Write an enzyme that holds these catalytic residues in place. Structure first.
Site, mmCIF file in Angstrom:
data_model
loop_
_atom_site.group_PDB
_atom_site.id
_atom_site.type_symbol
_atom_site.label_atom_id
_atom_site.label_comp_id
_atom_site.label_asym_id
_atom_site.label_seq_id
_atom_site.Cartn_x
_atom_site.Cartn_y
_atom_site.Cartn_z
ATOM 1 C CB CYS A 246 -0.948 -0.008 1.203
ATOM 2 S SG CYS A 246 -2.586 0.716 0.896
ATOM 3 C CG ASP B 116 -5.929 -0.519 9.757
ATOM 4 O OD1 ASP B 116 -5.642 -1.113 8.698
ATOM 5 O OD2 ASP B 116 -5.684 0.689 9.945
#
Length: 191
Positions: free
Chosen positions: A7, A124
């Protein structure tokens, strides 16, 4: 078998190298306040050159925007990273594959996550508490403070569909350390 998602890509060099190194997903951050922010046009230049899954990361953006950007950047997936209501995610899913990101710190967050069990979940983050729920999620993606040194440990415990990383492989914000990407994927998939 474990997939790797890189990412926060901001340049072609990094994108392509991630592909060569065996990355399965490359993510563009469409959040203005992120030091890894990238505009739609800039992304499109990159995205279009890629033969692997391209993922756009959005934080609390309204659907009309998300769809427009996705269409323009030629994204394949979209990672909703905010407090987006279930109906909202389903309206987007009717048009494009969506992954829902959920913040995880303790147990109540896991139940909160189950409310979105129908979509690929990206946790997360401690991997310790994911265990009693692991077999409830479709395609779980693990993220948070991961790097070459700790991936093996993370994977062995959770055994997730894919692993996600960003700063764990940087020379500095927005720019990836080519040597770190190589090492991260190497350790991750077990080479």
């Amino acid at each position: 078998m474990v997939r790797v998602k890189i990412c926060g890509i901001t340049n072609l060099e990094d994108a392509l190298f991630s592909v060569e190194s065996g990355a399965d997903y490359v993510g563009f951050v469409f959040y203005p306040k992120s030091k890894r922010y990238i505009s739609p046009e800039d992304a499109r230049r990159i995205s279009v050159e890629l033969p692997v899954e391209r993922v756009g990361v959005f934080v609390n953006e309204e659907p009309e925007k998300i769809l427009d950007v996705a269409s323009y950047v030629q994204l394949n997936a979209v990672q909703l990273h905010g407090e987006e209501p279930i109906e909202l995610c389903r309206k987007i899913a009717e048009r494009i594959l969506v992954w829902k990101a959920v913040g995880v710190s303790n147990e109540r967050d896991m139940e909160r996550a189950l409310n979105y069990r129908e979509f690929p979940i990206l946790l997360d983050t401690d991997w310790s508490l994911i265990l009693p729920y692991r077999d409830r999620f479709r395609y779980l993606v693990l993220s948070g403070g991961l790097n070459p040194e700790n991936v093996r440990s993370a994977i062995d415990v959770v055994r997730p569909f894919a692993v996600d990383v960003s700063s764990g492989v940087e020379a500095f914000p927005g720019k990836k350390d080519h040597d770190s990407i190589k090492m991260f994927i190497k350790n991750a998939k077990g080479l």
